[PDB]
């Protein structure tokens, strides 16, 4: 049960960061759309 409770406390810690990462997704969508409308040459190494 130690492994299971470790997994549960890890995912509980992730629960808090879930909302921060969601707002990160939103703001990065905004930034990517702005960059596209600013017409910047995205690098080949760019991950979409």
């Amino acid at each position: 049960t130690s492994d299971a409770v470790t997994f549960i406390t890890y995912v509980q810690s992730l629960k808090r960061k879930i909302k921060q990462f969601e707002k990160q997704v939103e703001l990065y969508r905004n930034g990517q759309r702005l960059l596209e409308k600013q017409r910047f040459q995205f690098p080949p190494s760019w991950l979409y």
């Binding site: 759309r33 596209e36 409308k37 040459q41 995205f42």
Partner: protein, 63 residues
């Protein structure tokens, strides 16, 4: 030589263009009126033969 040319060949991307629409409508069926209503104009011109107009398409995502 080139180089300046070959670097310019890796343009990042492209937006869709060159699309066309074909239609038949009987004479005086309001076809011109409804076509010109798509772009918002109240009326174009009812004439003879093939006619040509626009299609104002704007995407907010791509601006």
């Amino acid at each position: 030589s080139s180089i300046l040319s070959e670097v310019s060949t890796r343009a990042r991307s492209k937006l869709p263009s060159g699309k066309n629409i074909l239609v038949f409508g009987e004479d005086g069926s309001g076809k011109t009126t409804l076509m010109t209503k798509l772009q918002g104009a109240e009326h174009g011109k009812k004439g003879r033969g093939l006619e040509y107009l626009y299609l104002s398409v704007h995407d907010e995502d791509r601006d």
